[PDB]
Every structure is written in structure tokens, then in C-alpha cells.
Amino acid sequence: STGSATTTPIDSLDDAYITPVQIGTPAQTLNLDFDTGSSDLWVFSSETTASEVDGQTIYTPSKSTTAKLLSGATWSISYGDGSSSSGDVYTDTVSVGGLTVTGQAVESAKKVSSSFTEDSTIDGLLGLAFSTLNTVSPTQQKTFFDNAKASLDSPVFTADLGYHAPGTYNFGFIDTTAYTGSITYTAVSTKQGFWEWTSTGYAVGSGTFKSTSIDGIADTGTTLLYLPATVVSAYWAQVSGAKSSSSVGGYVFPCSATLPSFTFGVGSARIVIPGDYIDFGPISTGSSSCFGGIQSSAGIGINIFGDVALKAAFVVFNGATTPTLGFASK
């Protein structure tokens, strides 16, 4: 089997991407944030504290003839951005772009943090990291991809995120028309539960490539590119007037600037992030100070190849017995 679904930016800055997901019978379609940095499929629901729902579409398991309470199971998650959610668990039928999993754990939110409530466009998350990170207790549950894998034509999914435009998540096949050149594959460590890999270096604009190992995670659920302070300083030094602002919480730059590209290495291959991908707009409405899309990972504890990086590539998440990651230009 295969699946193919369009993923759409939630706003003009590509702060996140939403993908429609069918849950239950009859189908209830929710727009979920596909997150290769976590492993829970959780949704706003009829059980979510009413004051914490503001415009989201909810899953109502009592209206689904295939929903079954997973007795005794609870979940609770906290994300790197400080947001969180928790609740109980149903199993139900879940379909993404024509690919159907029966008995998928659908984690129903009883509580969500303010960041989730305030974002009307995201109805929940669909985790695509390794199932070892799944938070369901006392019986850990499998991700949608893990459940689908054996049925897929090939045990892979691909992320093709757009810049200020829709893109695609495919399951079970590689669309050879979706990228240019070749796909370069690179080793993955699953020891922390993430799609963790090592970039071979970077360049700033038309500058020379610096060969250096950068361990990080491929994370579709993180907006920005978070890299070591040395790398980030070298990038922003090429933008007149750019500075790190402790008050704002990162590097800012004059909105009048033209940003240089940023290249990262994948083995001997190179992925170029155009300068415009690194512009996240005014820090506040009407400001001439703009927020940078490349930020320091210092104090995150890990480097994160988030959407800023991934959207410059066609990315293969290869879930074979020994997982790997593939990157192509597009």
C-alpha cells in the first residue's frame, strides 16, 4: 500500500504545516502537525477542557463506531518549546492520504497548554519519530508509520515541505519526479528515539564549505534551524546589523537586509537553503526588526534540522531494519 497527502503551511511564515487525517467511522477529518521529532498521535477532542478549545476541530470518539477506549491508558507529553498536553487513549481507524491503519492509538487530549489553544489551525500532532518515544502508559503505543510499515510497498515516508506553498507527505514510495539529481543517504542513530544524523558541514552564502560534523535531528515539527553557536554566529556575521537579542530570544536582523543562503552537507552532497527561507518577519507587528530562521541550539542540548532546513530538500525517512535518512535537492 501507499499514501499521499498534501501538507499546507498554517500561516504566511510557514510556522508549521498541517496535513488532513481521517479518524474514525464515519471519518472525522482533523488537520494534524506531522512531527518527525515526537511519537504520539494526539488530538483535540470532545474530552478536551472546554476553556482550552478555541476554534480547533475535535475528535469525538463516541460518534465513531470503530473507536474503543484503550482501558487504563493515559499519556502526557512536553515538547522542546515548553508546550504540553495530556489525556486518555482510544484505538480507532486512521487514514492518511489513502493509507489506512486499523487499531491506531489516538490519544485524546483532556488538557492542552496555552500555545495549543491559541493556535486554531492545529487540531493535534501525528508523531513520526521512533515508537520508543511514545508516552502512552502503562503500555507504550506504536506510531502511525510503525503500524503501517509492514503493509507499505517500501518501509519509508518522505517529507517534501514547501516554501510559502503546500507540499507533500508520501508513505510507502519515493516519488522520483519530486526532486532533482540523486538522493544522498546518510546514517541514522535511533538511540535517542529521533531521526538523528550527522551533517558533514556548512557554508554561508558563496563562502567556502567548512567540513565539520554536526549531529542533529530531522524534525518536521520544529520551525527553525538550530545549530551550534559558532555556526550561527558565522552566518549572522554576514548580515549587516544582525545581532543576538536576549530580550527577543535570538538573532534578529534589519528587515531591509537581503539574507545570504546557508548550505549544509549530507555526505558529499550539499543542500542550499535560500536566504529568503531564513526570514521570519517582524518580531512584532510593524517592527523593522526581523526574526532569524537560523538560531543557536546552545542550551537545547541537540541541533535541530527543522522546517527551514527540511523544506529546502526532498527528505526520505527510511524505516528499514537499519533506518537511514535521504536528502535530495528539488
UniProtKB/Swiss-Prot annotation:
The active site is at D35, S199. The keyword Hydrolase applies. The keyword Oxidoreductase does not apply. Disulfide bonds join C255-C290. It is an enzyme of class 3 (hydrolase). One of its GO terms (biological process) is proteolysis. Belongs to the peptidase A1 family. This is Endothiapepsin. It comes from Cryphonectria parasitica (Chestnut blight fungus). The chain holds residues 90 to 419 of 419 of the full protein.
